Amino acid sequence: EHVILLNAQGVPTGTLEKYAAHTADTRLHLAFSSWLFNAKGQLLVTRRALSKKAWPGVWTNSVCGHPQLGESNEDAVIRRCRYELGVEITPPESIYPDFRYRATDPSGIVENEVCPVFAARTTSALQINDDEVMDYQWCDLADVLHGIDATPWAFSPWMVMQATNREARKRLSAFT
Amino acid sequence: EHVILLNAQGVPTGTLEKYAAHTADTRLHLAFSSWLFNAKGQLLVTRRALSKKAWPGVWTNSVCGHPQLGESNEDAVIRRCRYELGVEITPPESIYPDFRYRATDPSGIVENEVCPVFAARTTSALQINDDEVMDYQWCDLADVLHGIDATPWAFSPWMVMQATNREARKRLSAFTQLKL
Ligand SMILES: CN(C)CCOP(=O)(O)OP(=O)(O)O
Ligand SMILES: CN(C)CCOP(=O)(O)OP(=O)(O)O
Numbered sequence: 635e636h637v638i639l640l641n642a643q644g645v646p647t648g649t650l651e652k653y654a655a656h657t658a659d660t661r662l663h664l665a666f667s668s669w670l671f672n673a674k675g676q677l678l679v680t681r682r683a684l685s686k687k688a689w690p691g692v693w694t695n696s697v698c699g700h701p702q703l704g705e706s707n708e709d710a711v712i713r714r715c716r717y718e719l720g721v722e723i724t725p726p727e728s729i730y731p732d733f734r735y736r737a738t739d740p741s742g743i744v745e746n747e748v749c750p751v752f753a754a755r756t757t758s759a760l761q762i763n764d765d766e767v768m769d770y771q772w773c774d775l776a777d778v779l780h781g782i783d784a785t786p787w788a789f790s791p792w793m794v795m796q797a798t799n800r801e802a803r804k805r806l807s808a809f810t
Numbered sequence: 811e812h813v814i815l816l817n818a819q820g821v822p823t824g825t826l827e828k829y830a831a832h833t834a835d836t837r838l839h840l841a842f843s844s845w846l847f848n849a850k851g852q853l854l855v856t857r858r859a860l861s862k863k864a865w866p867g868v869w870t871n872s873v874c875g876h877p878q879l880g881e882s883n884e885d886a887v888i889r890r891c892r893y894e895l896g897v898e899i900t901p902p903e904s905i906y907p908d909f910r911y912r913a914t915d916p917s918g919i920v921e922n923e924v925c926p927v928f929a930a931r932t933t934s935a936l937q938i939n940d941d942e943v944m945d946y947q948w949c950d951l952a953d954v955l956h957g958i959d960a961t962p963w964a965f966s967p968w969m970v971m972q973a974t975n976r977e978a979r980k981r982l983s984a985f986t987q988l989k990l
């Protein structure tokens with residue numbers, strides 16, 4: 635797997651091996667973030683495995699990843715949903731298309747991404763990949779937002795930034 | 811380091827090497843939990859290092875540990891504060907002396923402890939021990955308690971149980987006053 639490096643205008647300029655790509659000096663690359671809900675409308679919150687190179691052991695939104703060259707954002711979501719959580723989903727819908735951020739994790743590992751955000755509903759049960767996910771919780775979105783508003787540091791920085799975007803949050807309130 | 815083993819009534823019976831003692835088969839032993847506030851009245855929340863045997867990478871109250879043989883619970887609190895956090899404190903106050911709990915962590919390691927809970931004020935800068943603590947936040951208690959009520963699964967179980975105890979909570983509230 636690779637990440638796709640981006641320039642100022644946001645044009646792909648090349649690739650890097652994914653693990654190799656996330657360092658103390660991570661360069662701008664393409665990513666996605668996804669928020670998964672079940673048929674009943676609960677939000678799936680996950681806890682990244684301890685072996686993750688960036689933000690290991692951190693609570694965060696359902697699934698995030700790195701689109702590969704020539705891959706649509708929607709397919710990346712579907713691929714990573716299957717891969718990390720072994721779950722099938724409805725066609726991902728856009729909730730925050732211009733999200734972009736840079737952040738540093740407690741060990742100094744940086745994420746620097748153009749990171750469009752999507753939402754979808756699961757259509758099958760989870761089958762956890764414990765290389766990616768060490769724990770998860772099916773929750774009411776309202777409580778998760780309250781938790782995010784009260785103690786944002788208990789969650790991944792990008793999850794917090796997405797959920798506090800006025801529009802994203804409105805859009806998330808529709809899967810409930 | 812060792813833990814002090816206890817029976818049902820909470821009577822010491824002996825000691826055990828610490829790492830050795832914390833397994834999927836943890837016996838009742840003595841411990842402590844402490845909630846630390848700065849002069850401003852903010853609560854120190856910490857994140858356990860990734861290398862901890864139990865609940866690594868989890869957010870939790872300021873400092874916990876295991877008193878050693880010949881050691882008072884309060885002295886143990888002072889030592890761990892120093893060891894984990896580099897920080898000097900005011901004499902620890904008892905806020906939940908009969909807290910006891912058993913809990914299984916995400917990889918199956920058991921804590922089974924008689925764990926009196928204290929609160930204190932820090933009187934020096936922090937000097938985080940990255941061997942023990944991977945991250946921290948200085949917070950408003952109210953925010954913390956709201957977080958714990960909204961998403962209790964995002965914190966250590968003992969933080970949650972202590973925080974929801976009526977009496978403990980009242981006493982933590984007393985440490986939010988600014989104090990010169
Ligand atoms: C929101 N950004 C961090 C996307 C990060 O996704 P991951 O960290 O899960 O990358 P990957 O899942 O591909 O390992
Ligand atoms: C509240 N319990 C967990 C006390 C044990 O906390 P620790 O994990 O800090 O034990 P130790 O600090 O001795 O390693």
Ligand SMILES: [Mg+2]
Nearest residue numbers: 697698699718
């Ligand atoms: Mg991922």
Ligand SMILES: [Mg+2]
Nearest residue numbers: 873874875894
């Ligand atoms: Mg400790």
Ligand SMILES: [Mn+2]
Nearest residue numbers: 665745746747
């Ligand atoms: Mn990335």
Ligand SMILES: [Mn+2]
Nearest residue numbers: 841921922923
């Ligand atoms: Mn113990």
